[PDB]
Every structure is written in C-alpha cells, then in structure tokens.
C-alpha cells in the first residue's frame, strides 16, 4: 500500500514541517503519493539538496522508524534549543519550526564550538537530515550565533563537507531574507557521524532508521 501525504510534498513531510503530517500512518510502503502543490514543502526558503535522490531512497520502504537521534533535553547544554522558531514556519497561528530539526542559537552572548557525534546502533541504515543557515546581514549573524566568522563540518566514513555560510540579503520569501539549505546522508550501521559548528547549523533532532 502506498504512503499518502497530506498538505505537503516529500520535503515538508520528511523535515517535519508542522503542517505536513501524512494521511497514511504506515511504517512501510510501495511508493509515495504526493500533493497538488508544486513546492516541495520547505517553509523557510532555501534549497533542498539531492532531493530527487532522496525521493528514490524513500520510494519502496520495508521498515521506517523515527527516533530522536539527539534528544532535545540532553544534547545541547551550551546552546539555546528553544528560540529557533520563525514566522516562515507557522503552527496554528504561532511561530514554529520543523519537528525533526532544531535551529540552535546562542545562549546569552555565547556560542561555544559544538561537537556532537552519533554511532548508528539501529542495525540498519539511518537517514540523517540537517540544515545550514545563511543569514541576511552581519547583525543577523551576530544576533543568532554571536561568532562573525562561523563554519559547520559534517563527517562520516561516507560523507565529508565543510560549510561556509554566505551572509547576504536575498529577496523576501515568507518574510525571510536569509536562506536555509537542507542536506541529508545515510549512516551505515556501526558508523559514526560527527557534527561540528561555530554557528549556522540546524541540527538533527529526529532521524529515521530504514530498510528498502
């Protein structure tokens, strides 16, 4: 039986856009029936990277389990995990954000270097998704992350990328002049994924153990 999506297409659903819960409630499916929308379902403007490849990866799944890869309550003692909400991503009138990610911001006037790792203990491939935020101005950068010159690194045995955000005023999209790009990778069982940042990282909160 196919997986029926609700208000949004695959991007919005997999990121956990508050509006985009599926109509089907299955943990396996033969294919995915999407929606009448032509946008992918991301609420904060930006580009979902390797999107077509993810759609194929999520096409015929035999098991699918959402789990909290980095628990909100215990993963980030040195950063703020409550303030990352936006008018771009509303939930019943209120500023919100994707359920599966956390928009980490500075706590006080401090954003220490974060370093967070996960070793896949699910016994199957784990789909991990994250975001890189590109602020509109220097003040935006400093207001969110304190550090003017930040970087992000994501690494596994299969993946390696260093991100340098570009600070620039883009045209307003849902009132947003910054941009977020969205990334993902599959982590082999027993392999380690490491996140490192001095700012601008939209961290995983929920990931997905799966089998095709």
From TrEMBL:
<comment type="similarity">
    <text>Belongs to the influenza viruses hemagglutinin family.</text>
</comment>
<feature type="disulfide bond">
    <location>
        <begin position="8"/>
        <end position="20"/>
    </location>
</feature>
<comment type="subunit">
    <text>Homotrimer of disulfide-linked HA1-HA2. Interacts with human CACNA1C.</text>
</comment>
<feature type="disulfide bond">
    <location>
        <begin position="43"/>
        <end position="89"/>
    </location>
</feature>
<comment type="function">
    <text>Binds to sialic acid-containing receptors on the cell surface, bringing about the attachment of the virus particle to the cell. This attachment induces virion internalization of about two third of the virus particles through clathrin-dependent endocytosis and about one third through a clathrin- and caveolin-independent pathway. Plays a major role in the determination of host range restriction and virulence. Class I viral fusion protein.</text>
</comment>
<comment type="function">
    <text>Binds to sialic acid-containing receptors on the cell surface, bringing about the attachment of the virus particle to the cell. This attachment induces virion internalization either through clathrin-dependent endocytosis or through clathrin- and caveolin-independent pathway. Plays a major role in the determination of host range restriction and virulence. Class I viral fusion protein. Responsible for penetration of the virus into the cell cytoplasm by mediating the fusion of the membrane of the endocytosed virus particle with the endosomal membrane.</text>
</comment>
<protein>
    <recommendedName>
        <fullName>Hemagglutinin</fullName>
    </recommendedName>
</protein>
